[PDB]
Amino acid sequence: PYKHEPFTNFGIEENRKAFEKALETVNNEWLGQSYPLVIDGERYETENKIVSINPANKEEVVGTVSKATQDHAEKAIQAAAKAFETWRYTDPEERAAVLFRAVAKVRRKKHEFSALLVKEAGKPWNEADADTAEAIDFMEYYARQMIELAKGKPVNSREGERNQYVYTPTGVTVVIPPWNFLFAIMAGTTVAPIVTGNTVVLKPASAAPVIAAKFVEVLEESGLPKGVVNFVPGSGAEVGDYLVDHPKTSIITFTGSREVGTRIFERAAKVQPGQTHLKQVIAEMGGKDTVVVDEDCDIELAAQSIFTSAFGFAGQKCSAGSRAVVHEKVYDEVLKRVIEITESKKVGEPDSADVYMGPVIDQASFNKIMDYIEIGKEEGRLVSGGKGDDSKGYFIEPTIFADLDPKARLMQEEIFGPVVAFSKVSSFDEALEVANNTEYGLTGAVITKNRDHINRAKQEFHVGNLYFNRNCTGAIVGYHPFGGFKMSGTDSKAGGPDYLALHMQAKTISEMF
């Protein structure tokens, strides 16, 4: 019985005023508060801290969170291990219930959760609203999915026996979510194991730990027993490796970079002394996403599709289309039109609805993107943006490079910033060739009036999320399941039908009479 959370229409004055009301509530009350580690229901504070800043205004502290060590991580694993022993026998109805009232708490404070993402992550108003609505969706949808899974799957029974095929919970689950989709993905990859009866150690992205802290609190208020959820933000150097390596860790659910995910996949397979199981890794490892524009297309749609793909949340999306692969017949026109839409938009602090683009997340991220913009001048032609300054916030203009070789670094490597790369092709055959030439297979868009080309792409464009005559940054839970092939990870389709069963192990029960 599921339909998605409607986005806030920011054209109505009645909606615009409520968000304005909510942002000053966050500005004055929610901000600058202090958040401890949470292990087995107990609050741990350290003298050493992670300081969360407003990326649009680098000297406004959003909050200061305690930083965990290898000892705190050790205690978190045991907390979750011990808590698993009872939580795994909890009625699926009473696990889905924790999610249902956690939804209700988030829906009540919808605009102020959104306003915190604005503050902590530098998210524009529509983007921050979409993240919260998507967080709501995950919880609603995974609650309902567990109810359905508790019915089991039918198998054949011979005359004189009763055969049952059911799902059981697995073990301790290390959750490592990213900074970019700070709410939704972290809400989804946290609630999915918990509703399926597993116990969680949550290592939120240190680039944004206040939302996760606020979310952990929401789950404690929702009926979670001590140790089911554990909050341990810290260094991937000390804490991260330790959680992955631990003998009692059963599953790691990871969303982030390819280089980190590769390390995790490799490390988790190594059966440690005292380990009595094989570790499962669920990994979404970003992408390098492609908008194919055919010879015969709606040009306006092609341009609007490239634009939103490239510059939704300053290009800092796993799904972000940093690649424009465009037919020679329409090349110069589509490029002309993309430049017009791009530089008509306003980049600044998201203190109003009309700001389409905010800043990047931090200094390290600012540097990397700025290091990549230099590479684009050596490899292509700068036709828009390329300017950035980190003096008030980490602000970089939406950047467009043209005339790229299909094998250029800018056409191959994840940038996670407001950058597109244009490449001209001379047929649809060559367009799929270049579209398929990266190490990734997350998302892809095709813009075409040609029916044969749609049908061909359905078989031949090798991405997990394939789109026709629209942008490649859709991903709505229950409508478009999300996950990719190749180096985009293990293709675990978040917000689809198969995802909860990935956290569970099947049990066959048979009684001979």
Side-chain angles (χ1 to χ4, degrees), residues 84-118:
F84 177 69
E85 278 149 5
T86 52
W87 180 249
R88 75 144 107 201
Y89 304 115
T90 318
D91 186 26
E93 285 268 6
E94 309 182 290
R95 272 140 47 182
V98 169
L99 270 61
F100 275 129
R101 51 196 171 246
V103 166
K105 282 149 179 301
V106 171
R107 195 182 272 128
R108 185 189 290 112
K109 292 264 205 169
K110 185 177 183 192
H111 294 300
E112 30 267 288
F113 271 114
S114 289
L116 186 53
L117 291 152
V118 172

PDB file of all heavy atoms in Angstrom, residues 84-118:
ATOM      1  N   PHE A  84      22.155  -8.252  19.296  1.00  0.00           N
ATOM      2  CA  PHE A  84      21.660  -9.114  18.219  1.00  0.00           C
ATOM      3  C   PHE A  84      20.972 -10.374  18.724  1.00  0.00           C
ATOM      4  O   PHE A  84      19.937 -10.771  18.187  1.00  0.00           O
ATOM      5  CB  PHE A  84      22.790  -9.469  17.245  1.00  0.00           C
ATOM      6  CG  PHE A  84      22.383 -10.415  16.150  1.00  0.00           C
ATOM      7  CD1 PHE A  84      21.507 -10.012  15.148  1.00  0.00           C
ATOM      8  CD2 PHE A  84      22.883 -11.713  16.120  1.00  0.00           C
ATOM      9  CE1 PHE A  84      21.131 -10.893  14.139  1.00  0.00           C
ATOM     10  CE2 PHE A  84      22.515 -12.593  15.125  1.00  0.00           C
ATOM     11  CZ  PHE A  84      21.638 -12.187  14.131  1.00  0.00           C
ATOM     12  N   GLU A  85      21.534 -10.955  19.783  1.00  0.00           N
ATOM     13  CA  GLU A  85      21.056 -12.199  20.397  1.00  0.00           C
ATOM     14  C   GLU A  85      19.579 -12.214  20.795  1.00  0.00           C
ATOM     15  O   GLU A  85      18.958 -13.273  20.843  1.00  0.00           O
ATOM     16  CB  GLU A  85      21.926 -12.547  21.598  1.00  0.00           C
ATOM     17  CG  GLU A  85      23.229 -13.262  21.220  1.00  0.00           C
ATOM     18  CD  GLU A  85      24.388 -12.960  22.170  1.00  0.00           C
ATOM     19  OE1 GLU A  85      24.178 -12.270  23.195  1.00  0.00           O
ATOM     20  OE2 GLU A  85      25.517 -13.416  21.882  1.00  0.00           O
ATOM     21  N   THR A  86      19.024 -11.042  21.070  1.00  0.00           N
ATOM     22  CA  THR A  86      17.615 -10.930  21.422  1.00  0.00           C
ATOM     23  C   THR A  86      16.804 -10.271  20.297  1.00  0.00           C
ATOM     24  O   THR A  86      15.696 -10.709  19.988  1.00  0.00           O
ATOM     25  CB  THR A  86      17.433 -10.151  22.740  1.00  0.00           C
ATOM     26  OG1 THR A  86      18.133  -8.911  22.647  1.00  0.00           O
ATOM     27  CG2 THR A  86      17.989 -10.941  23.921  1.00  0.00           C
ATOM     28  N   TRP A  87      17.380  -9.235  19.686  1.00  0.00           N
ATOM     29  CA  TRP A  87      16.734  -8.451  18.622  1.00  0.00           C
ATOM     30  C   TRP A  87      16.357  -9.280  17.383  1.00  0.00           C
ATOM     31  O   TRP A  87      15.358  -8.992  16.717  1.00  0.00           O
ATOM     32  CB  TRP A  87      17.621  -7.257  18.240  1.00  0.00           C
ATOM     33  CG  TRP A  87      17.075  -6.372  17.154  1.00  0.00           C
ATOM     34  CD1 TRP A  87      17.565  -6.237  15.897  1.00  0.00           C
ATOM     35  CD2 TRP A  87      15.931  -5.510  17.234  1.00  0.00           C
ATOM     36  NE1 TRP A  87      16.803  -5.348  15.177  1.00  0.00           N
ATOM     37  CE2 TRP A  87      15.794  -4.884  15.977  1.00  0.00           C
ATOM     38  CE3 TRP A  87      15.010  -5.203  18.247  1.00  0.00           C
ATOM     39  CZ2 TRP A  87      14.779  -3.958  15.705  1.00  0.00           C
ATOM     40  CZ3 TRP A  87      13.993  -4.295  17.973  1.00  0.00           C
ATOM     41  CH2 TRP A  87      13.885  -3.687  16.710  1.00  0.00           C
ATOM     42  N   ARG A  88      17.135 -10.329  17.119  1.00  0.00           N
ATOM     43  CA  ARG A  88      16.875 -11.253  16.020  1.00  0.00           C
ATOM     44  C   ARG A  88      15.610 -12.095  16.186  1.00  0.00           C
ATOM     45  O   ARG A  88      15.162 -12.719  15.223  1.00  0.00           O
ATOM     46  CB  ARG A  88      18.072 -12.185  15.801  1.00  0.00           C
ATOM     47  CG  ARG A  88      18.214 -13.293  16.836  1.00  0.00           C
ATOM     48  CD  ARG A  88      18.722 -14.549  16.158  1.00  0.00           C
ATOM     49  NE  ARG A  88      20.114 -14.838  16.486  1.00  0.00           N
ATOM     50  CZ  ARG A  88      20.915 -15.612  15.760  1.00  0.00           C
ATOM     51  NH1 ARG A  88      20.488 -16.164  14.633  1.00  0.00           N
ATOM     52  NH2 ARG A  88      22.163 -15.819  16.154  1.00  0.00           N
ATOM     53  N   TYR A  89      15.048 -12.131  17.393  1.00  0.00           N
ATOM     54  CA  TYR A  89      13.805 -12.876  17.620  1.00  0.00           C
ATOM     55  C   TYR A  89      12.580 -11.969  17.735  1.00  0.00           C
ATOM     56  O   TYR A  89      11.479 -12.453  17.993  1.00  0.00           O
ATOM     57  CB  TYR A  89      13.913 -13.790  18.849  1.00  0.00           C
ATOM     58  CG  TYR A  89      15.059 -14.777  18.805  1.00  0.00           C
ATOM     59  CD1 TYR A  89      16.106 -14.700  19.731  1.00  0.00           C
ATOM     60  CD2 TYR A  89      15.108 -15.781  17.834  1.00  0.00           C
ATOM     61  CE1 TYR A  89      17.163 -15.604  19.699  1.00  0.00           C
ATOM     62  CE2 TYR A  89      16.170 -16.692  17.793  1.00  0.00           C
ATOM     63  CZ  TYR A  89      17.190 -16.596  18.730  1.00  0.00           C
ATOM     64  OH  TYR A  89      18.242 -17.485  18.697  1.00  0.00           O
ATOM     65  N   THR A  90      12.774 -10.666  17.542  1.00  0.00           N
ATOM     66  CA  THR A  90      11.687  -9.692  17.620  1.00  0.00           C
ATOM     67  C   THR A  90      10.779  -9.863  16.416  1.00  0.00           C
ATOM     68  O   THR A  90      11.258  -9.999  15.293  1.00  0.00           O
ATOM     69  CB  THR A  90      12.210  -8.241  17.656  1.00  0.00           C
ATOM     70  OG1 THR A  90      13.342  -8.159  18.525  1.00  0.00           O
ATOM     71  CG2 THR A  90      11.133  -7.271  18.153  1.00  0.00           C
ATOM     72  N   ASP A  91       9.474  -9.882  16.672  1.00  0.00           N
ATOM     73  CA  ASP A  91       8.441  -9.964  15.641  1.00  0.00           C
ATOM     74  C   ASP A  91       8.677  -8.894  14.572  1.00  0.00           C
ATOM     75  O   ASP A  91       8.875  -7.721  14.911  1.00  0.00           O
ATOM     76  CB  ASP A  91       7.067  -9.778  16.297  1.00  0.00           C
ATOM     77  CG  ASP A  91       5.905  -9.989  15.336  1.00  0.00           C
ATOM     78  OD1 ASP A  91       6.047 -10.719  14.326  1.00  0.00           O
ATOM     79  OD2 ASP A  91       4.821  -9.427  15.609  1.00  0.00           O
ATOM     80  N   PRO A  92       8.721  -9.304  13.283  1.00  0.00           N
ATOM     81  CA  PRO A  92       8.841  -8.366  12.160  1.00  0.00           C
ATOM     82  C   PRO A  92       7.872  -7.179  12.199  1.00  0.00           C
ATOM     83  O   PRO A  92       8.247  -6.082  11.784  1.00  0.00           O
ATOM     84  CB  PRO A  92       8.567  -9.253  10.947  1.00  0.00           C
ATOM     85  CG  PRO A  92       9.170 -10.569  11.344  1.00  0.00           C
ATOM     86  CD  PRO A  92       8.970 -10.695  12.843  1.00  0.00           C
ATOM     87  N   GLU A  93       6.662  -7.393  12.719  1.00  0.00           N
ATOM     88  CA  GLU A  93       5.696  -6.307  12.946  1.00  0.00           C
ATOM     89  C   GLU A  93       6.207  -5.211  13.896  1.00  0.00           C
ATOM     90  O   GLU A  93       5.945  -4.031  13.667  1.00  0.00           O
ATOM     91  CB  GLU A  93       4.366  -6.859  13.465  1.00  0.00           C
ATOM     92  CG  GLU A  93       3.502  -7.536  12.414  1.00  0.00           C
ATOM     93  CD  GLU A  93       2.514  -6.591  11.741  1.00  0.00           C
ATOM     94  OE1 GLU A  93       2.555  -5.366  11.995  1.00  0.00           O
ATOM     95  OE2 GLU A  93       1.684  -7.084  10.951  1.00  0.00           O
ATOM     96  N   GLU A  94       6.951  -5.636  14.922  1.00  0.00           N
ATOM     97  CA  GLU A  94       7.519  -4.764  15.960  1.00  0.00           C
ATOM     98  C   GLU A  94       8.913  -4.220  15.608  1.00  0.00           C
ATOM     99  O   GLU A  94       9.553  -3.558  16.423  1.00  0.00           O
ATOM    100  CB  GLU A  94       7.572  -5.515  17.297  1.00  0.00           C
ATOM    101  CG  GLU A  94       6.249  -6.167  17.701  1.00  0.00           C
ATOM    102  CD  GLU A  94       6.316  -6.863  19.054  1.00  0.00           C
ATOM    103  OE1 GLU A  94       6.989  -7.913  19.162  1.00  0.00           O
ATOM    104  OE2 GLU A  94       5.683  -6.361  20.008  1.00  0.00           O
ATOM    105  N   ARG A  95       9.377  -4.531  14.403  1.00  0.00           N
ATOM    106  CA  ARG A  95      10.586  -3.945  13.815  1.00  0.00           C
ATOM    107  C   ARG A  95      10.167  -2.871  12.818  1.00  0.00           C
ATOM    108  O   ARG A  95      10.699  -1.758  12.830  1.00  0.00           O
ATOM    109  CB  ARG A  95      11.432  -5.026  13.148  1.00  0.00           C
ATOM    110  CG  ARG A  95      12.392  -5.676  14.108  1.00  0.00           C
ATOM    111  CD  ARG A  95      12.535  -7.148  13.935  1.00  0.00           C
ATOM    112  NE  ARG A  95      12.722  -7.563  12.552  1.00  0.00           N
ATOM    113  CZ  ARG A  95      12.826  -8.832  12.172  1.00  0.00           C
ATOM    114  NH1 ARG A  95      12.783  -9.802  13.074  1.00  0.00           N
ATOM    115  NH2 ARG A  95      12.978  -9.132  10.889  1.00  0.00           N
ATOM    116  N   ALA A  96       9.178  -3.210  11.990  1.00  0.00           N
ATOM    117  CA  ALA A  96       8.527  -2.263  11.074  1.00  0.00           C
ATOM    118  C   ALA A  96       7.856  -1.104  11.806  1.00  0.00           C
ATOM    119  O   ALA A  96       7.836   0.020  11.304  1.00  0.00           O
ATOM    120  CB  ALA A  96       7.514  -2.992  10.193  1.00  0.00           C
ATOM    121  N   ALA A  97       7.320  -1.387  12.990  1.00  0.00           N
ATOM    122  CA  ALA A  97       6.737  -0.366  13.862  1.00  0.00           C
ATOM    123  C   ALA A  97       7.733   0.729  14.250  1.00  0.00           C
ATOM    124  O   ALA A  97       7.363   1.902  14.250  1.00  0.00           O
ATOM    125  CB  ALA A  97       6.155  -1.007  15.110  1.00  0.00           C
ATOM    126  N   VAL A  98       8.982   0.346  14.568  1.00  0.00           N
ATOM    127  CA  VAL A  98      10.056   1.309  14.907  1.00  0.00           C
ATOM    128  C   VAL A  98      10.296   2.285  13.760  1.00  0.00           C
ATOM    129  O   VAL A  98      10.475   3.473  13.981  1.00  0.00           O
ATOM    130  CB  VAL A  98      11.402   0.605  15.309  1.00  0.00           C
ATOM    131  CG1 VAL A  98      12.562   1.605  15.397  1.00  0.00           C
ATOM    132  CG2 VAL A  98      11.267  -0.119  16.638  1.00  0.00           C
ATOM    133  N   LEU A  99      10.260   1.766  12.534  1.00  0.00           N
ATOM    134  CA  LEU A  99      10.387   2.574  11.323  1.00  0.00           C
ATOM    135  C   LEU A  99       9.180   3.476  11.099  1.00  0.00           C
ATOM    136  O   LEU A  99       9.354   4.646  10.760  1.00  0.00           O
ATOM    137  CB  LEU A  99      10.607   1.685  10.097  1.00  0.00           C
ATOM    138  CG  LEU A  99      12.045   1.346   9.704  1.00  0.00           C
ATOM    139  CD1 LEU A  99      12.786   0.577  10.789  1.00  0.00           C
ATOM    140  CD2 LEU A  99      12.031   0.548   8.414  1.00  0.00           C
ATOM    141  N   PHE A 100       7.978   2.936  11.311  1.00  0.00           N
ATOM    142  CA  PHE A 100       6.729   3.680  11.071  1.00  0.00           C
ATOM    143  C   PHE A 100       6.568   4.923  11.946  1.00  0.00           C
ATOM    144  O   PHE A 100       6.166   5.977  11.460  1.00  0.00           O
ATOM    145  CB  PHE A 100       5.502   2.779  11.210  1.00  0.00           C
ATOM    146  CG  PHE A 100       5.159   2.018   9.959  1.00  0.00           C
ATOM    147  CD1 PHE A 100       4.959   0.638  10.007  1.00  0.00           C
ATOM    148  CD2 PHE A 100       5.010   2.676   8.739  1.00  0.00           C
ATOM    149  CE1 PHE A 100       4.640  -0.080   8.854  1.00  0.00           C
ATOM    150  CE2 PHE A 100       4.681   1.968   7.581  1.00  0.00           C
ATOM    151  CZ  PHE A 100       4.498   0.586   7.639  1.00  0.00           C
ATOM    152  N   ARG A 101       6.892   4.812  13.229  1.00  0.00           N
ATOM    153  CA  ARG A 101       6.883   5.992  14.078  1.00  0.00           C
ATOM    154  C   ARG A 101       8.137   6.871  13.921  1.00  0.00           C
ATOM    155  O   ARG A 101       8.095   8.054  14.271  1.00  0.00           O
ATOM    156  CB  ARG A 101       6.592   5.649  15.547  1.00  0.00           C
ATOM    157  CG  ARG A 101       7.443   4.563  16.154  1.00  0.00           C
ATOM    158  CD  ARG A 101       6.814   4.039  17.455  1.00  0.00           C
ATOM    159  NE  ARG A 101       7.506   2.846  17.946  1.00  0.00           N
ATOM    160  CZ  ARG A 101       6.983   1.624  18.021  1.00  0.00           C
ATOM    161  NH1 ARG A 101       5.723   1.402  17.666  1.00  0.00           N
ATOM    162  NH2 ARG A 101       7.725   0.620  18.471  1.00  0.00           N
ATOM    163  N   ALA A 102       9.231   6.313  13.385  1.00  0.00           N
ATOM    164  CA  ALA A 102      10.404   7.133  13.043  1.00  0.00           C
ATOM    165  C   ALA A 102      10.143   7.965  11.791  1.00  0.00           C
ATOM    166  O   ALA A 102      10.635   9.087  11.692  1.00  0.00           O
ATOM    167  CB  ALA A 102      11.665   6.288  12.879  1.00  0.00           C
ATOM    168  N   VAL A 103       9.383   7.403  10.846  1.00  0.00           N
ATOM    169  CA  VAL A 103       8.807   8.156   9.714  1.00  0.00           C
ATOM    170  C   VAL A 103       8.000   9.325  10.236  1.00  0.00           C
ATOM    171  O   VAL A 103       8.230  10.465   9.827  1.00  0.00           O
ATOM    172  CB  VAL A 103       7.878   7.275   8.810  1.00  0.00           C
ATOM    173  CG1 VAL A 103       7.035   8.127   7.862  1.00  0.00           C
ATOM    174  CG2 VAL A 103       8.673   6.324   8.000  1.00  0.00           C
ATOM    175  N   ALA A 104       7.080   9.027  11.154  1.00  0.00           N
ATOM    176  CA  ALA A 104       6.128  10.003  11.708  1.00  0.00           C
ATOM    177  C   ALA A 104       6.823  11.179  12.387  1.00  0.00           C
ATOM    178  O   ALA A 104       6.388  12.316  12.247  1.00  0.00           O
ATOM    179  CB  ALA A 104       5.157   9.314  12.679  1.00  0.00           C
ATOM    180  N   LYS A 105       7.918  10.893  13.091  1.00  0.00           N
ATOM    181  CA  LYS A 105       8.756  11.924  13.704  1.00  0.00           C
ATOM    182  C   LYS A 105       9.458  12.805  12.666  1.00  0.00           C
ATOM    183  O   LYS A 105       9.609  14.014  12.872  1.00  0.00           O
ATOM    184  CB  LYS A 105       9.790  11.291  14.642  1.00  0.00           C
ATOM    185  CG  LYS A 105       9.237  10.873  15.999  1.00  0.00           C
ATOM    186  CD  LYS A 105       9.972   9.657  16.564  1.00  0.00           C
ATOM    187  CE  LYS A 105       9.436   9.263  17.940  1.00  0.00           C
ATOM    188  NZ  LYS A 105       9.599  10.403  18.887  1.00  0.00           N
ATOM    189  N   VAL A 106       9.881  12.200  11.555  1.00  0.00           N
ATOM    190  CA  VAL A 106      10.601  12.926  10.506  1.00  0.00           C
ATOM    191  C   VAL A 106       9.612  13.758   9.701  1.00  0.00           C
ATOM    192  O   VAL A 106       9.901  14.902   9.370  1.00  0.00           O
ATOM    193  CB  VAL A 106      11.462  11.973   9.611  1.00  0.00           C
ATOM    194  CG1 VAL A 106      12.045  12.692   8.389  1.00  0.00           C
ATOM    195  CG2 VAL A 106      12.596  11.369  10.422  1.00  0.00           C
ATOM    196  N   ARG A 107       8.432  13.192   9.441  1.00  0.00           N
ATOM    197  CA  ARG A 107       7.366  13.889   8.719  1.00  0.00           C
ATOM    198  C   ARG A 107       6.817  15.101   9.494  1.00  0.00           C
ATOM    199  O   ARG A 107       6.474  16.121   8.892  1.00  0.00           O
ATOM    200  CB  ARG A 107       6.247  12.915   8.325  1.00  0.00           C
ATOM    201  CG  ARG A 107       5.296  13.457   7.277  1.00  0.00           C
ATOM    202  CD  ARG A 107       4.180  12.492   6.933  1.00  0.00           C
ATOM    203  NE  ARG A 107       4.576  11.571   5.872  1.00  0.00           N
ATOM    204  CZ  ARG A 107       4.474  10.246   5.939  1.00  0.00           C
ATOM    205  NH1 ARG A 107       3.967   9.660   7.015  1.00  0.00           N
ATOM    206  NH2 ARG A 107       4.867   9.500   4.914  1.00  0.00           N
ATOM    207  N   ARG A 108       6.767  14.990  10.821  1.00  0.00           N
ATOM    208  CA  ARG A 108       6.353  16.089  11.693  1.00  0.00           C
ATOM    209  C   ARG A 108       7.346  17.253  11.631  1.00  0.00           C
ATOM    210  O   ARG A 108       6.949  18.417  11.600  1.00  0.00           O
ATOM    211  CB  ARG A 108       6.200  15.599  13.140  1.00  0.00           C
ATOM    212  CG  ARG A 108       5.648  16.642  14.116  1.00  0.00           C
ATOM    213  CD  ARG A 108       5.713  16.181  15.569  1.00  0.00           C
ATOM    214  NE  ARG A 108       4.771  15.097  15.851  1.00  0.00           N
ATOM    215  CZ  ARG A 108       5.120  13.844  16.135  1.00  0.00           C
ATOM    216  NH1 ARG A 108       6.401  13.500  16.192  1.00  0.00           N
ATOM    217  NH2 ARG A 108       4.186  12.932  16.371  1.00  0.00           N
ATOM    218  N   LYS A 109       8.635  16.922  11.607  1.00  0.00           N
ATOM    219  CA  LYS A 109       9.708  17.917  11.587  1.00  0.00           C
ATOM    220  C   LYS A 109      10.369  17.987  10.202  1.00  0.00           C
ATOM    221  O   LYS A 109      11.581  18.211  10.096  1.00  0.00           O
ATOM    222  CB  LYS A 109      10.750  17.577  12.662  1.00  0.00           C
ATOM    223  CG  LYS A 109      10.273  17.720  14.121  1.00  0.00           C
ATOM    224  CD  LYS A 109      10.656  19.078  14.707  1.00  0.00           C
ATOM    225  CE  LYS A 109      10.778  19.050  16.230  1.00  0.00           C
ATOM    226  NZ  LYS A 109      11.416  20.305  16.745  1.00  0.00           N
ATOM    227  N   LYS A 110       9.563  17.801   9.153  1.00  0.00           N
ATOM    228  CA  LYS A 110      10.053  17.661   7.778  1.00  0.00           C
ATOM    229  C   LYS A 110      10.928  18.816   7.325  1.00  0.00           C
ATOM    230  O   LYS A 110      12.053  18.613   6.874  1.00  0.00           O
ATOM    231  CB  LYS A 110       8.893  17.467   6.794  1.00  0.00           C
ATOM    232  CG  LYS A 110       9.351  17.191   5.363  1.00  0.00           C
ATOM    233  CD  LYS A 110       8.196  16.935   4.414  1.00  0.00           C
ATOM    234  CE  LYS A 110       8.723  16.598   3.028  1.00  0.00           C
ATOM    235  NZ  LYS A 110       7.656  16.605   1.990  1.00  0.00           N
ATOM    236  N   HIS A 111      10.410  20.027   7.470  1.00  0.00           N
ATOM    237  CA  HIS A 111      11.080  21.197   6.935  1.00  0.00           C
ATOM    238  C   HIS A 111      12.324  21.587   7.727  1.00  0.00           C
ATOM    239  O   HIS A 111      13.251  22.167   7.160  1.00  0.00           O
ATOM    240  CB  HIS A 111      10.103  22.370   6.794  1.00  0.00           C
ATOM    241  CG  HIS A 111       9.034  22.146   5.770  1.00  0.00           C
ATOM    242  ND1 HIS A 111       9.313  21.915   4.438  1.00  0.00           N
ATOM    243  CD2 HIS A 111       7.685  22.120   5.880  1.00  0.00           C
ATOM    244  CE1 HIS A 111       8.183  21.754   3.774  1.00  0.00           C
ATOM    245  NE2 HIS A 111       7.179  21.874   4.625  1.00  0.00           N
ATOM    246  N   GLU A 112      12.347  21.255   9.019  1.00  0.00           N
ATOM    247  CA  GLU A 112      13.520  21.538   9.865  1.00  0.00           C
ATOM    248  C   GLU A 112      14.632  20.505   9.727  1.00  0.00           C
ATOM    249  O   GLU A 112      15.804  20.825   9.946  1.00  0.00           O
ATOM    250  CB  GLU A 112      13.161  21.760  11.347  1.00  0.00           C
ATOM    251  CG  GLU A 112      11.939  21.024  11.844  1.00  0.00           C
ATOM    252  CD  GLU A 112      10.668  21.853  11.752  1.00  0.00           C
ATOM    253  OE1 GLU A 112      10.530  22.808  12.548  1.00  0.00           O
ATOM    254  OE2 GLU A 112       9.816  21.553  10.881  1.00  0.00           O
ATOM    255  N   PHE A 113      14.272  19.271   9.378  1.00  0.00           N
ATOM    256  CA  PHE A 113      15.279  18.306   8.945  1.00  0.00           C
ATOM    257  C   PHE A 113      15.888  18.783   7.637  1.00  0.00           C
ATOM    258  O   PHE A 113      17.114  18.819   7.500  1.00  0.00           O
ATOM    259  CB  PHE A 113      14.700  16.899   8.796  1.00  0.00           C
ATOM    260  CG  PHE A 113      14.763  16.088  10.053  1.00  0.00           C
ATOM    261  CD1 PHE A 113      13.598  15.706  10.709  1.00  0.00           C
ATOM    262  CD2 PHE A 113      15.991  15.718  10.592  1.00  0.00           C
ATOM    263  CE1 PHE A 113      13.652  14.961  11.879  1.00  0.00           C
ATOM    264  CE2 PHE A 113      16.058  14.968  11.754  1.00  0.00           C
ATOM    265  CZ  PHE A 113      14.886  14.589  12.402  1.00  0.00           C
ATOM    266  N   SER A 114      15.023  19.183   6.702  1.00  0.00           N
ATOM    267  CA  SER A 114      15.450  19.778   5.432  1.00  0.00           C
ATOM    268  C   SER A 114      16.349  20.994   5.641  1.00  0.00           C
ATOM    269  O   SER A 114      17.402  21.105   5.011  1.00  0.00           O
ATOM    270  CB  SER A 114      14.244  20.146   4.569  1.00  0.00           C
ATOM    271  OG  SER A 114      13.607  18.988   4.069  1.00  0.00           O
ATOM    272  N   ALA A 115      15.960  21.866   6.569  1.00  0.00           N
ATOM    273  CA  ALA A 115      16.722  23.070   6.886  1.00  0.00           C
ATOM    274  C   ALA A 115      18.093  22.782   7.511  1.00  0.00           C
ATOM    275  O   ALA A 115      19.004  23.605   7.414  1.00  0.00           O
ATOM    276  CB  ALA A 115      15.922  23.960   7.795  1.00  0.00           C
ATOM    277  N   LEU A 116      18.226  21.628   8.158  1.00  0.00           N
ATOM    278  CA  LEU A 116      19.504  21.211   8.731  1.00  0.00           C
ATOM    279  C   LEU A 116      20.470  20.718   7.649  1.00  0.00           C
ATOM    280  O   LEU A 116      21.677  20.961   7.738  1.00  0.00           O
ATOM    281  CB  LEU A 116      19.294  20.157   9.825  1.00  0.00           C
ATOM    282  CG  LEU A 116      20.505  19.690  10.644  1.00  0.00           C
ATOM    283  CD1 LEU A 116      21.288  20.850  11.259  1.00  0.00           C
ATOM    284  CD2 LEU A 116      20.074  18.696  11.711  1.00  0.00           C
ATOM    285  N   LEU A 117      19.930  20.046   6.628  1.00  0.00           N
ATOM    286  CA  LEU A 117      20.703  19.632   5.449  1.00  0.00           C
ATOM    287  C   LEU A 117      21.195  20.856   4.684  1.00  0.00           C
ATOM    288  O   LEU A 117      22.332  20.875   4.199  1.00  0.00           O
ATOM    289  CB  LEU A 117      19.864  18.745   4.518  1.00  0.00           C
ATOM    290  CG  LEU A 117      19.454  17.329   4.927  1.00  0.00           C
ATOM    291  CD1 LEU A 117      18.164  16.935   4.252  1.00  0.00           C
ATOM    292  CD2 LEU A 117      20.524  16.332   4.579  1.00  0.00           C
ATOM    293  N   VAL A 118      20.332  21.869   4.583  1.00  0.00           N
ATOM    294  CA  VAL A 118      20.703  23.182   4.037  1.00  0.00           C
ATOM    295  C   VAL A 118      21.933  23.720   4.763  1.00  0.00           C
ATOM    296  O   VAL A 118      22.902  24.126   4.127  1.00  0.00           O
ATOM    297  CB  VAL A 118      19.541  24.221   4.152  1.00  0.00           C
ATOM    298  CG1 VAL A 118      20.005  25.624   3.751  1.00  0.00           C
ATOM    299  CG2 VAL A 118      18.347  23.813   3.307  1.00  0.00           C
TER     300      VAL A 118
END
